[PDB]
Design a protein around this ligand. Structure first.
Ligand SMILES: [Mg+2]
Ligand SMILES: [Mg+2]
Ligand SMILES: [Mg+2]
Ligand SMILES: [Mg+2]
Ligand SMILES: [Mg+2]
Ligand SMILES: [Mg+2]
Ligand SMILES: [Mg+2]
Ligand SMILES: [Mg+2]
Ligand SMILES: [Mg+2]
Ligand SMILES: [Mg+2]
Ligand SMILES: [Mg+2]
Ligand SMILES: [Mg+2]
Ligand SMILES: [Mg+2]
Ligand SMILES: [Mg+2]
Ligand SMILES: [Mg+2]
Ligand SMILES: [Mg+2]
Ligand SMILES: [Mg+2]
Lengths: 123, 80, 205, 129, 82, 150
RNA sequence: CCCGCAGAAGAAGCACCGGCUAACUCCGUGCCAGCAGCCGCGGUAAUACGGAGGGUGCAAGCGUUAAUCGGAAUUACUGGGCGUAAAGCGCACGCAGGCGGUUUGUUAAGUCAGAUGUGAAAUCCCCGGGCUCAACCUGGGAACUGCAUCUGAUACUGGCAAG
RNA sequence: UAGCUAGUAGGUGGGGUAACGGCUCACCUAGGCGACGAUCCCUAGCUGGUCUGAGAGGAUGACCAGCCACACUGGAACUGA
């Protein structure tokens, strides 16, 4: 590893690729939302995690989980993507932003309202 | 006085033209180690007085021509 | 902001009397100091090495009323200062006008002094000031606006001032509501069961 | 092959020290002497001699304080294939001062301290602490 | 066109023009040749508030430099004889 | 007089014909506050039992480190196993800036202002032992004079 | 900006609370619904899901997402490794290149010192000022780790001479 | 991507420009560049600085200022300092 060596072949960095190609390094993207599924989770866990195939604006048919209990996404439901991989759901590296666009928000929610988009209850 | 670099002639196949090399130390901007770099200039030899290998000396001047702006001042060795 | 809430509660957490309710009587009891900072306070948990620092830091912070952000910047200074970050930080706090006013009889509690400052009731060197975080340099004279020196709260404050300790680094003529700033409070006269380094380190984690 | 005589001298000392060897020897040379001298003037070696006429030797006596050796650490710095030159306001401070750094200056081979004071820089050689 | 004028460098509502020799073509706060003296339209009888350094100013003015109506006034507003 | 800091404790097991066998191991250091420290490692079936017996080991067989004021006499670089440690003396008031096991020993040792950074194996059991060895390398200036001069 | 005029009046929220990490309980639920950065939580007494009560952190903000550096001594100049963990060309000869035993002299290129140009101002930094403070603004100095010229110094490296 | 290059590289002459010059043209020579990486491909305005970092370094180049380039796209002159 003598100096010379490095002088002729300098140290090489790397190119850690984005774990989520939401393109242009955008905080969020809009999608048409093709279909809505309920695939089963991975190995250790078991349930019916509700996911949906969205069609991003730039044209990147990806998937995204629907946090919170109960949603309302149907067919041509315009929604926003957040980007948050889900372990029990392979292929799912994004999260559908709740409360935004055509996507509603978790009702009856109280604790942690910001997430799942929910305005203050009342008083 | 004037600055003049001396170097060994690497090429002499042009009319009045001559290619000369010039070695030069340099500290690595991160390794310290001094490396011997070389520069290739196309000095002007109107008299063809100097030949190949001849350690000649030259100075900067008016652009006598493209890729040519240095004129030979005097030879310092008639090649080995 | 300024917290504005159950002041005693804060003192219960730190396990000491931050003088947040430096009223006449009281002083412990009538709140159950050191019994349970909350509903589960009853239990005696084991503070982690980090928590020990986060608490030591939180205490000294709420003592002067200063919030996180502002405090943060103070530390930033304590370091860039050609002195000792330790003392520097404490001094930076003591220099606070809202703090100075308090230590000069005026205002029963620091939280009370704050109001006097903000309400144009105080004046430093023939000049009115309402910035609690105003830094008071030496030689400065801390006085009260006459239209506020005959106020009720003022005298009542100095009522227990003489009863309380004494700032061995600043003059204060209770007669005409004066208050000279002799010099910075050395680590000694400003000392207490408060070891700053514990926090100065937490700000380097 | 011996592409760095200075290193040999240095290594010879540390290796000997840990070996409890009374003294050490090796082929001398102008530079080796200068270094050995500074090592003595600073109290790292008892003394040092240079035997031989046509073939120079170097009777370098090691020094041991208590049940230990004086030279607890001695490594080369400005080695070949990688030279090192510093400025008056650059000379390294060996062991916060409790140590020394032999630096060859245009005035001679002195210690870091001296050089720094004389206001001249040079080429480091080792960090005897 | 080398001249000597002022350039705003203060906060909003609170300016701080700086006298500097530059080229007319260049914008106000643009590029200049050499900053010569300063000026402040505020002060507080701070004993200070307007510089100029006549010596340097002279060199340029006498070498073909001009002077803005404002800065020119400064040079005189201050006992230039001394 | 005697500072007792509990670095950390682990469970550890020992499988046998009958089955695994739960256990415990506690790592602690005891410092006087000026120039004496000593890590004590002990294990026992009970979580507490291990600590109590590990304290004895700490108290007994400590070490005297030439501590200049409240910092290190100079920057050292102790090491042990795959744990390399670098200790450097800080200014008065800089505070003790060290990792986990790092500070644990520096605090009870009497050190108050030092900015050291350890690397390699972060394992406590080996870090502390390495840290301790470091303080043992730093020699006082008067000691340096004892060497030469004479 | 000052003076006065009512009257506490017109002004608190966001995340988290199993460990990392500061903060715990009760219900409901029952590998479902759901959480989740990682380890992992849920299959009837869940501090980890949802609510409530309490607590912690931060504050006109709070949380999430996106992205750079950090941690990462994990591309290691400072500052790493290659017997078995990833890693010694299957082995030789050798051009270029890198490195070069010992002495005297000489040179003075690297190297060191001094100085002169220049390295825009603004940033940054120290001291000092000015808007009530602060942010902000500003005077001076420092720094700009660099390049070139000149005058020296000659230990070391390089050149040359004689060995 | 390992070879690139005929106004290519140099030389005489005439011409040309504010000016040095293959800038231009006729003639002569056979040269000039490249692994100290030419050519080709992709990406990109550069710098003072900015963010992070104990520093060395890494990532960057918005606002402010120095330089450069562009003005619907492609090309061309005129006037004019
Ligand atoms: Mg993420
Ligand atoms: Mg906790
Ligand atoms: Mg949660
Ligand atoms: Mg239950
Ligand atoms: Mg790194
Ligand atoms: Mg790690
Ligand atoms: Mg490794
Ligand atoms: Mg194997
Ligand atoms: Mg292997
Ligand atoms: Mg082999
Ligand atoms: Mg500048
Ligand atoms: Mg020589
Ligand atoms: Mg011609
Ligand atoms: Mg002509
Ligand atoms: Mg572009
Ligand atoms: Mg680092
Ligand atoms: Mg056009």
């Amino acid at each position: 590893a003598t100096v010379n060596q490095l002088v002729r072949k300098p140290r090489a960095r790397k190119v850690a690729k984005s774990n989520v190609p939401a393109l242009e390094a955008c905080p969020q993207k809009r999608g048409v939302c093709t279909r809505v599924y309920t695939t089963t989770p991975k190995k250790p866990n078991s349930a019916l995690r509700k996911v949906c195939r969205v069609r991003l604006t730039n044209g990147f048919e990806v998937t995204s989980y629907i946090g919170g209990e109960g949603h309302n996404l149907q067919e041509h439901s315009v929604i926003l993507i957040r980007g948050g991989r889900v372990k029990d759901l392979p292929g799912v590296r994004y999260h559908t932003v709740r409360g935004a666009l055509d996507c509603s928000g978790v009702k009856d929610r109280k604790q942690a309202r910001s997430k799942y988009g929910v305005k203050r209850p009342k008083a | 006085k004037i600055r003049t670099l001396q170097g060994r002639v690497v090429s002499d196949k042009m009319e009045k033209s001559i290619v000369v090399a010039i070695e030069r130390f340099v500290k690595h901007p991160i390794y310290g180690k001094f490396i011997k770099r070389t520069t290739k200039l196309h000095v002007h030899d109107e008299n063809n007085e100097c030949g190949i290998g001849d350690v000649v000396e030259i100075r900067e001047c008016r652009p006598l021509s493209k890729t040519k702006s240095w004129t030979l001042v005097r030879v310092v060795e008639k090649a080995v | 902001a300024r917290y504005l809430g159950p002041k005693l509660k804060l003192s219960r957490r730190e396990g000491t009397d931050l003088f947040l309710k430096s009223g006449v009587r009281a002083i412990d009891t009538k709140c159950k100091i050191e019994q349970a900072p909350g509903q589960h306070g009853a239990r005696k948990p084991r503070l982690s090495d980090y928590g020990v620092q986060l608490r030591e830091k939180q205490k000294v912070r709420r003592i002067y009323g200063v919030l996180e952000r502002q405090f943060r910047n103070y530390y930033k200074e304590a370091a860039r200062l050609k002195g000792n970050t330790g003392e520097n930080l404490l001094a930076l706090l003591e220099g606070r006008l809202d703090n100075v006013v308090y230590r000069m009889g005026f205002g029963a509690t620091r939280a009370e002094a704050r109001q006097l400052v903000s309400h144009k009731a105080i004046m430093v060197n023939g000049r009115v000031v309402n910035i609690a975080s105003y830094q008071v340099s030496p030689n400065d004279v801390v006085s009260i606006r006459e239209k506020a020196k005959k106020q009720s709260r003022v005298k009542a404050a100095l009522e227990l001032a003489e009863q309380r300790e004494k700032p061995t680094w600043l003059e204060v003529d209770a007669g005409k509501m004066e208050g000279t700033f002799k010099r910075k409070p050395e680590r000694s006269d400003l000392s207490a069961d408060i070891n700053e380094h514990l926090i100065v380190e937490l700000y380097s984690k | 092959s011996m592409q760095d005589p200075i290193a040999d001298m240095l290594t010879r000392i540390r290796n000997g020290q840990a070996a409890n060897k009374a003294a050490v020897t090796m082929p001398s040379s102008k530079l080796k002497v200068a270094i050995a001298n500074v090592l003595k003037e600073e109290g790292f070696i008892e003394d040092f001699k240079v035997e031989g006429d046509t073939k120079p030797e170097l009777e370098l006596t090691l020094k041991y304080f208590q049940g230990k050796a004086v030279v607890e650490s001695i490594q080369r710095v400005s080695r070949p294939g990688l030279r090192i030159y510093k400025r008056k306001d650059e000379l390294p401070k060996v062991m916060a001062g409790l140590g020394i750094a032999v630096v060859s200056t245009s005035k001679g081979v002195m210690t870091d301290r001296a050089a720094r004071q004389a206001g001249l820089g040079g080429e480091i050689i080792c960090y005897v602490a | 066109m080398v001249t000597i004028r002022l350039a705003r460098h203060g906060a909003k509502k609170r300016p701080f023009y700086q006298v500097v020799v530059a080229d007319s073509r260049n914008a106000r706060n643009g590029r200049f040749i050499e900053r010569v003296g300063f000026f402040n339209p505020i002060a507080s009888e701070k004993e200070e508030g307007t510089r100029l350094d006549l010596d340097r100013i002279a060199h340029w003015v006498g070498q073909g430099a001009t002077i803005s109506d404002r800065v020119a006034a400064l040079i005189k507003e201050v006992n230039k004889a001394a | 007089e005697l500072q007792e800091k509990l670095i950390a404790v682990n469970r550890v097991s020992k499988t046998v014909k009958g089955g695994r066998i739960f256990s415990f191991t506690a790592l602690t250091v005891v410092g006087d506050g000026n120039g004496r420290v000593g890590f004590g490692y002990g294990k026992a079936r009970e979580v507490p039992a291990a600590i109590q017996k590990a304290m004895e080991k700490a108290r007994r067989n400590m070490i005297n480190v030439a501590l200049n004021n409240g910092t290190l006499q100079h920057p050292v670089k102790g090491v042990h196993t795959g744990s390399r440690v670098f200790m450097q003396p800080a200014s008065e008031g800089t505070g003790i800036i060290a990792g986990g096991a790092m500070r644990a020993v520096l605090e009870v040792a009497g050190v108050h202002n030092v900015l050291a950074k350890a690397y390699g194996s972060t394992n406590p059991i080996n870090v502390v032992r390495a840290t301790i060895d470091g303080l043992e390398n730093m020699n006082s200036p008067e000691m340096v004079a004892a060497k030469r001069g004479k």
